[PDB]
Design a protein around this ligand. Structure first.
Ligand SMILES: O=P(O)(O)OC[C@H]1O[C@H](O)[C@H](O)[C@@H](O)[C@@H]1O
Length: 346
């Protein structure tokens, strides 16, 4: 088996070297592509925009994003998998030959296993939902041209994300291909599910509790058994160039809490009391109201994102991240429309 994964690793290293050497003027473009491809933008930009227009799309988008980031974590733990920025300096494969010279970037110090890519998986899962929903909405409200344009844009986005994750290292081509396929599969699976709407308040809590308990118990069971699931945190603390390039917000534990928090926040916002009576006469039916709601949500969420929880004790950071993630869907669905209604309603 060892002589089989080495071929894939060497192919990835050679591809990264070729991209980095023969394309040097596209560094900033690839960094920008890798920056605006974070899932943070799927909770702070896409969801507020898509919730106030055909609100059935926003709930599906949030559910797909959360379940995709839980499945990516769980399959990242078991599949293991290296990243082409510590493997180059740690392997003993490049003996009898010169080791290739690879370059690191302020974003190439990721902590975590990388067998399914997570940027590609999330981007595919979200943009497939968006494109399919738009095609369904504008279906004969010349369609072939729109179909071709939207699918071309989707595939261009996926290709650019793959090239970005390969150029800056931190991932192998088979990893990004697997991530794209898994994201598309998850998007389709939730495209054929109709129970995520009008769910009770007990359902959301039971679901998030089951996910958290499964993750924590699985980790504890393997840790007691003898294996170490958190092994990439030690290999990223030696081979990263600058010790300031690693952050705690990219620790497998942080993402899980940040996803459970936003799921619970969406549940609370949907099953609250202000949402059920947001309209008070003539409201929630006019374009100015919804456009102003979108603008206010975007501006206030962008301002509120600046509040960085203190990172001195890990438990405090985890709980504050949970609460801060829970705030955004609750404050974007229940509070801003209520304030706008009570101000410009009479
Ligand atoms: O695609 P990757 O390079 O593995 O990055 C994807 C991962 O980035 C962060 O570190 C988070 O832990 C995850 O929420 C995300 O899935």
């Amino acid at each position: 088996m060892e002589e089989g994964m080495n071929v894939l690793h060497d192919f990835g290293i050679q591809s990264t070297h070729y991209l980095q050497v023969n394309y040097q003027d596209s560094q900033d473009w690839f960094i920008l592509v890798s920056v605006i491809a974070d899932l943070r933008n799927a909770f702070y930009v896409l969801f507020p925009i898509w919730f106030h227009l055909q609100e059935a799309v926003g709930i599906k988008l949030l559910w797909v994003a959360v379940i995709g980031d839980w499945l990516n974590l769980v399959f990242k733990w078991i599949l293991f998998g290296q990243r082409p920025y510590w493997w180059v300096l740690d392997t003993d494969y490049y003996s009898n030959t010169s080791v290739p010279l690879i370059k690191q970037f302020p974003v190439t110090c990721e902590t975590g296993p990388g067998s399914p890519s997570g940027h590609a998986m999330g981007t595919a899962g979200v943009y497939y939902v968006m494109v399919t929903s738009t095609l369904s909405i504008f279906q004969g409200k010349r369609f072939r041209c729109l179909n071709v344009i939207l699918w071309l844009g989707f595939w261009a986005v996926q290709l650019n994300v793959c090239l970005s994750r390969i150029y800056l290292a931190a991932n192998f081509p088979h990893q990004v291909v697997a991530g794209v396929l898994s994201g598309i599969a998850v998007a389709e699976t939730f495209s054929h599910i109709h129970s995520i709407y009008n769910a009770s308040l007990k359902k959301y809590f039971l679901i998030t509790f089951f996910l958290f308990s499964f993750a924590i118990g699985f980790y504890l069971l393997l840790k007691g058994l003898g294996v170490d699931l958190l092994w990439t945190l030690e290999k990223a603390q030696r081979w990263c160039e600058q010790p300031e390039w690693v952050h705690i917000d990219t620790t497998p534990f942080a993402s899980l809490l940040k996803n459970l928090g936003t799921l619970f926040g969406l549940g609370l916002a949907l099953n609250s009391s202000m949402y059920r009576e947001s309209c008070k006469g003539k409201l929630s039916k006019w374009l100015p109201f919804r456009l102003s709601s979108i603008v206010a949500s975007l501006v206030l969420l962008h301002v509120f994102d600046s509040l960085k929880p203190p990172s001195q004790v890990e438990l405090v950071f985890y709980v504050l991240s949970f609460c801060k993630s829970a705030v955004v869907p609750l404050a974007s669905v229940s509070v801003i429309p209520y304030c706008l209604a009570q101000v410009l309603g009479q």
